[PDB]
Design an enzyme around this catalytic site. Sequence first.
Site, PDB file in Angstrom:
ATOM      1  N   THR A 124     -21.136  -2.024 -15.977  1.00 37.77           N
ATOM      2  CA  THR A 124     -20.095  -1.073 -15.626  1.00 37.77           C
ATOM      3  C   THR A 124     -18.795  -1.774 -15.254  1.00 37.77           C
ATOM      4  OG1 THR A 124     -21.628   0.634 -14.992  1.00 37.77           O
ATOM      5  CG2 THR A 124     -19.446   0.690 -13.941  1.00 37.77           C
ATOM      6  N   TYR A 129      -7.268  -5.160  14.181  1.00 44.71           N
ATOM      7  CA  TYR A 129      -6.293  -6.210  13.933  1.00 44.71           C
ATOM      8  C   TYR A 129      -6.532  -7.448  14.783  1.00 44.71           C
ATOM      9  CZ  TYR A 129      -3.800  -2.781  11.175  1.00 44.71           C
ATOM     10  OH  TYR A 129      -3.462  -1.833  10.245  1.00 44.71           O
ATOM     11  N   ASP A 166      -6.661  -5.146  -5.728  1.00 46.99           N
ATOM     12  CA  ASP A 166      -7.708  -5.065  -4.715  1.00 46.99           C
ATOM     13  C   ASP A 166      -8.669  -3.913  -5.025  1.00 46.99           C
ATOM     14  OD1 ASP A 166      -9.161  -5.328  -2.374  1.00 46.99           O
ATOM     15  OD2 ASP A 166      -7.581  -4.446  -1.096  1.00 46.99           O
ATOM     16  N   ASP A 188     -20.204  -2.497  -8.692  1.00 49.76           N
ATOM     17  CA  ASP A 188     -21.157  -1.808  -9.560  1.00 49.76           C
ATOM     18  C   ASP A 188     -21.974  -2.844 -10.310  1.00 49.76           C
ATOM     19  OD1 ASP A 188     -22.394   0.409 -10.963  1.00 49.76           O
ATOM     20  OD2 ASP A 188     -20.495   1.540 -10.738  1.00 49.76           O
ATOM     21  N   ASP A 232       0.831  -1.210   0.000  1.00 50.36           N
ATOM     22  CA  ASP A 232       0.000   0.000   0.000  1.00 50.36           C
ATOM     23  C   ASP A 232       0.870   1.267   0.000  1.00 50.36           C
ATOM     24  OD1 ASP A 232      -2.341  -1.342  -0.188  1.00 50.36           O
ATOM     25  OD2 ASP A 232      -2.526  -1.622   1.999  1.00 50.36           O
ATOM     26  N   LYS A 249     -12.011  -4.041  -5.531  1.00 55.14           N
ATOM     27  CA  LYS A 249     -13.330  -4.089  -4.900  1.00 55.14           C
ATOM     28  C   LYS A 249     -14.416  -3.601  -5.866  1.00 55.14           C
ATOM     29  CE  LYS A 249     -11.795  -4.053  -0.085  1.00 55.14           C
ATOM     30  NZ  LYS A 249     -10.349  -3.959  -0.313  1.00 55.14           N
ATOM     31  N   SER A 268     -12.971  -6.394   7.897  1.00 54.32           N
ATOM     32  CA  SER A 268     -12.259  -6.286   9.172  1.00 54.32           C
ATOM     33  C   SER A 268     -12.617  -5.041   9.972  1.00 54.32           C
ATOM     34  CB  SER A 268     -10.759  -6.280   8.921  1.00 54.32           C
ATOM     35  OG  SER A 268     -10.377  -5.195   8.111  1.00 54.32           O
TER      36      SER A 268
HETATM   37  O1  LIG Z   1     -27.905   0.941  -8.294  1.00 56.21           O
HETATM   38  C1  LIG Z   1     -27.143   1.468  -9.126  1.00 56.21           C
HETATM   39  C2  LIG Z   1     -26.111   2.353  -8.837  1.00 56.21           C
HETATM   40  C3  LIG Z   1     -25.441   3.003  -9.839  1.00 56.21           C
HETATM   41  O2  LIG Z   1     -24.597   3.922  -9.666  1.00 56.21           O
HETATM   42  N1  LIG Z   1     -25.680   2.635 -11.197  1.00 56.21           N
HETATM   43  C4  LIG Z   1     -24.934   3.307 -12.266  1.00 56.21           C
HETATM   44  O3  LIG Z   1     -25.820   4.132 -13.034  1.00 56.21           O
HETATM   45  C5  LIG Z   1     -25.573   3.957 -14.438  1.00 56.21           C
HETATM   46  C6  LIG Z   1     -26.744   3.264 -15.096  1.00 56.21           C
HETATM   47  O4  LIG Z   1     -26.522   3.333 -16.495  1.00 56.21           O
HETATM   48  P1  LIG Z   1     -27.660   2.873 -17.532  1.00 56.21           P
HETATM   49  O5  LIG Z   1     -28.758   3.928 -17.483  1.00 56.21           O
HETATM   50  O6  LIG Z   1     -26.933   2.859 -18.850  1.00 56.21           O
HETATM   51  O7  LIG Z   1     -28.166   1.497 -17.131  1.00 56.21           O
HETATM   52  C7  LIG Z   1     -24.265   3.191 -14.571  1.00 56.21           C
HETATM   53  O8  LIG Z   1     -23.135   4.059 -14.673  1.00 56.21           O
HETATM   54  C8  LIG Z   1     -24.200   2.398 -13.273  1.00 56.21           C
HETATM   55  O9  LIG Z   1     -22.846   2.158 -12.908  1.00 56.21           O
HETATM   56  C9  LIG Z   1     -26.711   1.741 -11.487  1.00 56.21           C
HETATM   57  O10 LIG Z   1     -27.002   1.475 -12.668  1.00 56.21           O
HETATM   58  N2  LIG Z   1     -27.369   1.194 -10.466  1.00 56.21           N
HETATM   59  O1  LIG Z   2     -11.920  -6.255   5.262  1.00 57.70           O
HETATM   60  C1  LIG Z   2     -10.973  -5.762   4.620  1.00 57.70           C
HETATM   61  C2  LIG Z   2     -10.756  -5.901   3.254  1.00 57.70           C
HETATM   62  C3  LIG Z   2      -9.596  -5.458   2.678  1.00 57.70           C
HETATM   63  O2  LIG Z   2      -9.256  -5.671   1.484  1.00 57.70           O
HETATM   64  N1  LIG Z   2      -8.678  -4.686   3.451  1.00 57.70           N
HETATM   65  C4  LIG Z   2      -7.454  -4.182   2.821  1.00 57.70           C
HETATM   66  O3  LIG Z   2      -6.312  -4.854   3.367  1.00 57.70           O
HETATM   67  C5  LIG Z   2      -5.270  -3.908   3.660  1.00 57.70           C
HETATM   68  C6  LIG Z   2      -5.068  -3.794   5.154  1.00 57.70           C
HETATM   69  O4  LIG Z   2      -3.890  -3.028   5.346  1.00 57.70           O
HETATM   70  P1  LIG Z   2      -3.246  -2.862   6.809  1.00 57.70           P
HETATM   71  O5  LIG Z   2      -2.634  -4.208   7.179  1.00 57.70           O
HETATM   72  O6  LIG Z   2      -2.206  -1.794   6.602  1.00 57.70           O
HETATM   73  O7  LIG Z   2      -4.334  -2.438   7.781  1.00 57.70           O
HETATM   74  C7  LIG Z   2      -5.659  -2.594   3.001  1.00 57.70           C
HETATM   75  O8  LIG Z   2      -5.136  -2.475   1.676  1.00 57.70           O
HETATM   76  C8  LIG Z   2      -7.179  -2.670   2.957  1.00 57.70           C
HETATM   77  O9  LIG Z   2      -7.680  -1.920   1.856  1.00 57.70           O
HETATM   78  C9  LIG Z   2      -8.900  -4.539   4.820  1.00 57.70           C
HETATM   79  O10 LIG Z   2      -8.067  -3.949   5.534  1.00 57.70           O
HETATM   80  N2  LIG Z   2     -10.018  -5.051   5.331  1.00 57.70           N
END
Ligand SMILES: O=c1cc(O)n([C@@H]2O[C@H](COP(=O)(O)O)[C@@H](O)[C@H]2O)c(=O)[nH]1
Ligand SMILES: O=c1cc(O)n([C@@H]2O[C@H](COP(=O)(O)O)[C@@H](O)[C@H]2O)c(=O)[nH]1
Lengths: 257, 257
Positions: free
Chosen positions: A99, A210, A90, A95, A37, A92, A150
């Site tokens: 998307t 932790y 990572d 959407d 990180d 995550k 976590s």
């Molecule tokens: O519940 C949700 C949350 C969103 O942000 N979105 C976002 O809104 C947009 C929907 O696009 P569309 O109207 O083309 O289906 C996309 O960018 C999508 O990531 C969604 O469709 N549903």
């Molecule tokens: O539940 C979760 C899921 C994760 O990916 N992470 C990720 O794992 C790493 C934890 O880092 P750290 O050991 O410095 O706290 C971070 O990159 C964080 O985004 C987390 O800490 N908890």
Amino acid sequence: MELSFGARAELPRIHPVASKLLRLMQKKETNLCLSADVSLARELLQLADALGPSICMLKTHVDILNDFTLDVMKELITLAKCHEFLIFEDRKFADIGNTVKKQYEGGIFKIASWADLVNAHVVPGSGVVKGLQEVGLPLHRGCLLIAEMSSTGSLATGDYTRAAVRMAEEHSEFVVGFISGSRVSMKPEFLHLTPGVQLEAGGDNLGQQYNSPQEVIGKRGSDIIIVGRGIISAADRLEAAEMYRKAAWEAYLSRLG
Amino acid sequence: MELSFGARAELPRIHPVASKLLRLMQKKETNLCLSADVSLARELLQLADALGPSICMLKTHVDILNDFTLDVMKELITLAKCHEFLIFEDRKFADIGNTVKKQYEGGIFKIASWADLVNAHVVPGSGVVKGLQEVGLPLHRGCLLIAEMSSTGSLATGDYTRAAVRMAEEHSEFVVGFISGSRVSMKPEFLHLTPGVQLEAGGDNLGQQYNSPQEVIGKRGSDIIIVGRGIISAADRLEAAEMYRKAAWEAYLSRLG
Ligand SMILES: O=c1cc(O)n([C@@H]2O[C@H](COP(=O)(O)O)[C@@H](O)[C@H]2O)c(=O)[nH]1
Ligand SMILES: O=c1cc(O)n([C@@H]2O[C@H](COP(=O)(O)O)[C@@H](O)[C@H]2O)c(=O)[nH]1
């Protein structure tokens, strides 16, 4: 009936990415994932080179790399191949399916081109996985689902965690395991990776909590520890990584008997 | 006791970003957010210029822009100022607080430098908001929390939705509203923005589900429609945007009486 990592690598339903990972874990005696990180490419690469022998996986947050380029990621692949570890972005994804497919394949990061593994939140429903797998199946990639978190106040509990396990277990052509605090699936084909790990008790001031490698691996039944600051804030990151590797590996052996 | 957008802009507890938005909605007779889900900067900018007068907000996914640069975003700000709309980067932050602060401020996108609004999933617990607000409060930004999703199998229901409302209502110095399918908070200081909107019934093949502007605004009580493909796949995007603007605006007026 608990199997070693090397035997799990051979299970009939194992995903090839999981099998590759499990084999190198067994070979290298490591179940440590470094959470790299950092914001500088040079630091990322120097950590990957020095710590590569100690880790099964290097977890990135490409979107905090101030000097990201795709050539950085080429360099990182060279080190992953040399030292034998997987690259886990990572990201995550979280959407709708239409998307996330674009976010995975495209834009400036082209994540699918270099990441062995990515992860996803399950909150959108299974279209998040379907969208990713339209990109990741052709590229022979894998995905991890976030079943537990976590951090303080996490809502990834109870029925939400159960929904994540079902969603995996039902997309097992692409989903290879979980981000979780504990073993959430009884099927040994699925990996469990656990962040929120340090040797000492504590947390941060933004909700991180932790637990130790012995707790996580040995008592809670997870496979791999994900460690960021416990390593990267230490002066000697190599010795810190070795401490975490030895802790996680012995906890695994002791559970295995 | 239901207030117009212009009166809501004056509420004692209104966030300045929400107030700015509500005023321009009232001025321009628009409660349409364009989801500018394109991969080319030129197309993004040409849409923003032509559709700017018709929209209250332009929602980006910066991570699908194949030719992103910060100078693109400077150009986009110029258009936002000219035409009077806010820029919403739909990043769906969804990590621990210590990670999301870096993702918001840093890396190559520097999101906080150009986005009026961002959004977050609530699954990590309130540290996700605390981490973002450490960046966004100094920069006078706002945030939206994802309380419901439009996609099939969404887990953002029931107690999860309630947790999102509480988390807002308790971080109201930074959180200005929700991504939701309906009105989820009774407090008129909070905005409700609803994606999954088309004039015609349907969905996509990756879990998207559509409802109409009359349903969403008029029956479900939301404030703003978010529309992607219903506009951007049309031949004449300007006339499509006008159709959606008129639909959402009349549904709002009729609800208001
Ligand atoms: O519940 C949700 C949350 C969103 O942000 N979105 C976002 O809104 C947009 C929907 O696009 P569309 O109207 O083309 O289906 C996309 O960018 C999508 O990531 C969604 O469709 N549903
Ligand atoms: O539940 C979760 C899921 C994760 O990916 N992470 C990720 O794992 C790493 C934890 O880092 P750290 O050991 O410095 O706290 C971070 O990159 C964080 O985004 C987390 O800490 N908890």
